[PDB]
């Protein structure tokens, strides 16, 4: 479907003849189509589309419910592969993060040791 302009917006033309958008409610103007927020990626890493990738299929079993077929690998599974992707993507980063924290924690420690050790000597 083609979205219509939200309530109380207006198109206008520049001298140039370019289109811009008048938002009367807020007494503002813009080069940006307001419905672009729904139809445009919001980042060079964003995709609006959540299509299953080539070879995957949605399926419904009356006993078991929704499930997914992977024709690439002659496989079926319950879990949305998209969801499991995002999960194990995140789990990858979330512990890649935690090792870096472990690293600094140690290296900060290895120099705190050179001081703390020199300290106990006085206690003699």
């Amino acid at each position: 479907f083609e979205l219509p302009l939200p309530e109380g917006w207006e198109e206008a033309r520049d001298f140039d003849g370019k289109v811009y958008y008048i938002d009367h409610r807020n007494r503002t103007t813009s080069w940006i189509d307001p419905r672009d927020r729904y139809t445009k990626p919001l980042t060079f890493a964003d995709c609006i589309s959540d299509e299953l990738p080539l070879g995957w299929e949605e399926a419904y079993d009356p006993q078991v419910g929704d499930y997914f077929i992977d024709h690439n690998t002659k496989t079926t599974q319950i879990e949305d592969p998209r969801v499991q992707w995002r999960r194990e993507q995140e789990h990858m980063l979330k512990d890649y993060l935690v090792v870096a924290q472990e690293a600094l924690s140690a290296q900060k420690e290895i120099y705190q040791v050179k001081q703390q050790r020199l300290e106990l000597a006085q206690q003699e």
């Binding site: 207006e10 198109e11 206008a12 033309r13 520049d14 811009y20 008048i22 007494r27 813009s30 080069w31």
Partner: peptide, 18 residues
């Protein structure tokens, strides 16, 4: 080369071709 400089749209207060 050099790109054309940024142009803002006509400000709200003022005349508009609609």
């Amino acid at each position: 080369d050099r790109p054309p400089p940024y142009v803002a749209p006509p400000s709200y207060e003022g005349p508009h071709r609609t």
